[PDB]
Amino acid sequence: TYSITLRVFQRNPGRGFFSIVEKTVFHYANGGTWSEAKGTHTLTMGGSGTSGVLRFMSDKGELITVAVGVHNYKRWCDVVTGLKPEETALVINPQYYNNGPRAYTREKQLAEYNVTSVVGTRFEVKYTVVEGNNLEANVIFS
Amino acid sequence: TYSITLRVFQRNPGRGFFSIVEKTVFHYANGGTWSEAKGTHTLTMGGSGTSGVLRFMSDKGELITVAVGVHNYKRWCDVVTGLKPEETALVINPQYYNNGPRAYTREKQLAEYNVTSVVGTRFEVKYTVVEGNNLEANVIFS
Amino acid sequence: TYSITLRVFQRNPGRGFFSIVEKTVFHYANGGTWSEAKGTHTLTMGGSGTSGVLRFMSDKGELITVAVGVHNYKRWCDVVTGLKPEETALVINPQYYNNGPRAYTREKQLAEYNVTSVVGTRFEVKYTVVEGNNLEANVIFS
Amino acid sequence: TYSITLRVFQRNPGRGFFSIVEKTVFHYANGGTWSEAKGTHTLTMGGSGTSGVLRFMSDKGELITVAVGVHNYKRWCDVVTGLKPEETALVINPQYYNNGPRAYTREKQLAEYNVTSVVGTRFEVKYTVVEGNNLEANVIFS
Numbered sequence: 047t048y049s050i051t052l053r054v055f056q057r058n059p060g061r062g063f064f065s066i067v068e069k070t071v072f073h074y075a076n077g078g079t080w081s082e083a084k085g086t087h088t089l090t091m092g093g094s095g096t097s098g099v100l101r102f103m104s105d106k107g108e109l110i111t112v113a114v115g116v117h118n119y120k121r122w123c124d125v126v127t128g129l130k131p132e133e134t135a136l137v138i139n140p141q142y143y144n145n146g147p148r149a150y151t152r153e154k155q156l157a158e159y160n161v162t163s164v165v166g167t168r169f170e171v172k173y174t175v176v177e178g179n180n181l182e183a184n185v186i187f188s
Numbered sequence: 189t190y191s192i193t194l195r196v197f198q199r200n201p202g203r204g205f206f207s208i209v210e211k212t213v214f215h216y217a218n219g220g221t222w223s224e225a226k227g228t229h230t231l232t233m234g235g236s237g238t239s240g241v242l243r244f245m246s247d248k249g250e251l252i253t254v255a256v257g258v259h260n261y262k263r264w265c266d267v268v269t270g271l272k273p274e275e276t277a278l279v280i281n282p283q284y285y286n287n288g289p290r291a292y293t294r295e296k297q298l299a300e301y302n303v304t305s306v307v308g309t310r311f312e313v314k315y316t317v318v319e320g321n322n323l324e325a326n327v328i329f330s
Numbered sequence: 331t332y333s334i335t336l337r338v339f340q341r342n343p344g345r346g347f348f349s350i351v352e353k354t355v356f357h358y359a360n361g362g363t364w365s366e367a368k369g370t371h372t373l374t375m376g377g378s379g380t381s382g383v384l385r386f387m388s389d390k391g392e393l394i395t396v397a398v399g400v401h402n403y404k405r406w407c408d409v410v411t412g413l414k415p416e417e418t419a420l421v422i423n424p425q426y427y428n429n430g431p432r433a434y435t436r437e438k439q440l441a442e443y444n445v446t447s448v449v450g451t452r453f454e455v456k457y458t459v460v461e462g463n464n465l466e467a468n469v470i471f472s
Numbered sequence: 473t474y475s476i477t478l479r480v481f482q483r484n485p486g487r488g489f490f491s492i493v494e495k496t497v498f499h500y501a502n503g504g505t506w507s508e509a510k511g512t513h514t515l516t517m518g519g520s521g522t523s524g525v526l527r528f529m530s531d532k533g534e535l536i537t538v539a540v541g542v543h544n545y546k547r548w549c550d551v552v553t554g555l556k557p558e559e560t561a562l563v564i565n566p567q568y569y570n571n572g573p574r575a576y577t578r579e580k581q582l583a584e585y586n587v588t589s590v591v592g593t594r595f596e597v598k599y600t601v602v603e604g605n606n607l608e609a610n611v612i613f614s
């Protein structure tokens with residue numbers, strides 16, 4: 047099994063306050079499950095080669111997704127911003143597979159990624175444990 | 189908009205204790221979002237014709253999904269039990285659409301449904317507010 | 331240290347639906363802390379001789395407390411029903427100590443307790459692991 | 473009645489990550505209740521003249537309390553840092569009343585408060601809606 051534990055940091059009240067509105071798990075590698083403990087979020091997966099997505103909404107209406115997973119035994123991440131209401135995590139998560147338009151991002155196996163949304167919100171995923179089967183990352187909103 | 193608010197009742201400790209491991213929203217009708225308040229769960233959707241799925245896991249390892257949505261202005265529900273780990277909610281939710289194998293169940297527009305899993309766990313969805321745009325249901329595990 | 335992990339089972343929608351409104355920890359035995367994981371609640375305490383209280387409110391307005399702790403190396407519990415709004419858990423938890431009016435209930439060291447409230451709600455605390463430092467109990471509202 | 477709704481912003485992973493370990497409500501003004509919705513926390517109180525406390529623990533072991541309430545129709549707040557394990561919120565909340573050692577801090581009726589702890593964690597409470605019965609504040613750990 048692989049697990050990825052996420053801690054969510056929100057830095058700037060001027061950007062609003064984000065909460066989870068959806069959590070998906072892709073079906074490769076015997077799937078996996080999201081759980082919550084002590085304010086953290088863990089994605090537990092059956093092996094290397096799958097992922098899951100958290101979609102967040104802010105109290106100012108902004109919609110963004112955070113994807114984390116393991117690709118060929120190395121962690122990966124992505125953040126997609128500027129989402130329309132119909133672009134749910136259920137739409138987004140499969141786009142990383144089957145030659146979909148985000149596959150290249152999974153293939154990068156990034157240990158960190160940073161994006162600013164068109165409305166001006168910074169998002170970062172930064173893995174703090176970057177190797178092994180019990181991975182850890184901070185997800186930072188600003 | 190349509191909303192469906194769920195209250196989860198668990199009746200029989202001998203069946204174990206269930207917690208949410210995944211939540212999806214289908215992309216029709218401008219999608220929608222899951223939220224939590226006072227121990228309840230609300231699916232808020234952009235109109236009639238979409239749905240979302242909660243997947244639960246028990247502390248005894250059982251995996252089941254609860255689907256709720258609105259079809260032609262009437263509520264519907266379904267429960268799928270006996271799931272394998274790879275049969276995530278991301279796999280299940282689309283099976284209600286595009287002529288998938290569960291579409292017929294959505295089309296029934298049920299206000300209640302009951303199933304017992306092969307391992308012996310009863311599940312019921314019972315709508316307590318069955319009309320209008322602010323729907324309410326109890327989800328009962330036993 | 332001692333821990334008590336609680337699983338809350340709500341059985342009967344006719345009683346309404348309860349959520350937590352307060353959680354206290356008494357200061358003996360170097361105090362302790364509440365945490366949440368996978369839908370469960372754990373009170374971790376620095377030794378034998380302290381306790382904590384969860385107060386619940388139903389969506390019908392009912393207020394009740396559940397107390398759990400360890401007294402002379404044995405678990406104890408209590409459920410107080412029919413509470414007025416001014417009788418917060420901060421009022422109730424100290425009543426088990428300093429010769430207060432509920433000390434005798436702590437001294438019973440009960441592994442199970444059953445009480446039905448003035449409005450008809452049945453409450454049960456039943457320890458499923460009843461000995462040792464890693465205690466477990468089901469809290470059932472029926 | 474008065475309510476105070478809190479949004480918790482954790483800014484700086486270098487301080488570790490905090491989660492709630494206790495929530496108390498003082499018994500004046502007919503008491504009150506904590507609730508959670510969309511990642512936020514609301515204390516609802518029966519009138520002016522009471523308060524509640526959230527205690528937080530970081531994954532580095534740091535213990536701090538945040539107190540919010542209404543005193544003579546104006547909001548107040550406090551943050552106490554450097555707490556020992558025996559100094560639970562049940563100990564701290566009453567210290568603002570009955571001529572206790574923190575009463576003067578309640579009497580200040582602060583709309584903002586900033587303090588840095590012995591281990592270097594910055595804490596700010598800043599009310600964003602500072603008048604009326606539906607108060608709002610950001611709690612920032614930095």
Ligand SMILES: CC(=O)N[C@@H]1[C@@H](O[C@@H]2O[C@H](CO)[C@H](O)[C@H](O)[C@H]2O)[C@@H](O)[C@@H](CO)O[C@@H]1O
Binds near residue numbers: 076
């Ligand atoms: C070892 C690894 O990460 N492999 C990745 C693939 O994962 C495998 O996918 C298959 C289905 O094709 C099956 O579910 C296996 O259990 C799973 O490990 C897959 O994610 C591909 C996608 O391009 O990348 C790797 O090869």
Ligand SMILES: CC(=O)N[C@@H]1[C@@H](O[C@@H]2O[C@H](CO)[C@H](O)[C@H](O)[C@H]2O)[C@@H](O)[C@@H](CO)O[C@@H]1O
Binds near residue numbers: 218235237258
């Ligand atoms: C009114 C209604 O419930 N219609 C259902 C359909 O929903 C519509 O679906 C389209 C896409 O085809 C679009 O997303 C609309 O916004 C949405 O209302 C759809 O769910 C079908 C599935 O067979 O059933 C109804 O017709």
Ligand SMILES: CC(=O)N[C@@H]1[C@@H](O[C@@H]2O[C@H](CO)[C@H](O)[C@H](O)[C@H]2O)[C@@H](O)[C@@H](CO)O[C@@H]1O
Binds near residue numbers: 400403428
């Ligand atoms: C061993 C045990 O459970 N003792 C109980 C007492 O707990 C002790 O209390 C003192 C303070 O007086 C101190 O906090 C110790 O750490 C703690 O173990 C206490 O709960 C009394 C209450 O009557 O019962 C036992 O003696």
Ligand SMILES: CC(=O)N[C@@H]1[C@@H](O[C@@H]2O[C@H](CO)[C@H](O)[C@H](O)[C@H]2O)[C@@H](O)[C@@H](CO)O[C@@H]1O
Binds near residue numbers: 569570
């Ligand atoms: C109006 C107001 O905020 N009054 C504060 C007091 O609150 C009152 O307290 C009494 C009990 O003495 C009772 O519970 C009332 O309902 C409540 O409004 C109290 O907090 C004092 C503390 O010094 O300050 C104000 O007077």
